[PDB]
């Protein structure tokens, strides 16, 4: 069916329960054997959110190269994405290091550092231009450059240095502030804005290598992120429009990282972002 009357469909009857456990019924069983060694406990943020190992993304490193995050590839859209866990206080340096390597140039945070008044990540950048910070363990440097604050994010300019090498490179910090502690947003403008942001910034385009994206397990408001962009960009290319089916291309990306869209809520919305985003593109 198509995308805007499927909708109106479930919603007349409230099925939208259903529909999720349908594609967490159908989604892809793979091994993650690396991310539960014993070695890797406090590596992990959440014990049930785990990288496969044959996406996983390995640190250029021989004693451990393991990190909580995983590499989405999308073949007809021709886009690739980082997924990952918000960064521990113990991961904070293989993070910076994993941008480094796969020569990212965007970070997408949809979090905040404290949500209903606990923890969700480290505070892994830093917070003014003359403290900048060092991760003695991956041998990088990081500094604030430039910070501009809006009603519903933050975009920050960085500087990441490798300091074997003195090799610098500019990061482009892209923060959404007002996702709600509980519940999804009511509409879709801001978000959609704010991806046609970091659209509009080069971080998503293949002259660079992939964003990193995150939020607290890097899989629910990280997933629907992902879904929105990778499903406009296939309206885009196609002849046909009305062919683009949100279910299966949330399957196919579930094929590289477990658990993508956590909630029937964050499903309707995710429909909803698309709905609306493809009246603005033309
Ligand atoms: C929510 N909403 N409803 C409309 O009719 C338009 C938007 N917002 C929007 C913002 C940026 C890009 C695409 C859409
Ligand atoms: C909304 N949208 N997004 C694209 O990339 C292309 C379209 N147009 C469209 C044409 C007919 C039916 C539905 C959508």
Redesign the pocket.
Known sequence: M??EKEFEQIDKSGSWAAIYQDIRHEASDFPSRVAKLPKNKNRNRYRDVSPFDHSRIKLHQEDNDYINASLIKMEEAQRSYILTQGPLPNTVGHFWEMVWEQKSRGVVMLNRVMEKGSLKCAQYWPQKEEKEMIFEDTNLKLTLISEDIKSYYTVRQLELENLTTQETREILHFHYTTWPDFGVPESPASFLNFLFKVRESGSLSPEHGPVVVHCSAGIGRSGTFCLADTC??????RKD??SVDIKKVLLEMRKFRMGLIQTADQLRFSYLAVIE???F??
């Open positions: 198509e995308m406009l960009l296939l309206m885009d290319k429009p009305s985003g493809a009246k593109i033309m």
